[PDB]
């Protein structure tokens, strides 16, 4: 229900 979920921290972002 969040965005932030668990392979994340805002570093997947980019790619």
Do not use: P
């Amino acid at each position: 229900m969040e965005e932030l979920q668990d392979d994340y921290e805002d570093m997947m972002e980019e790619n």
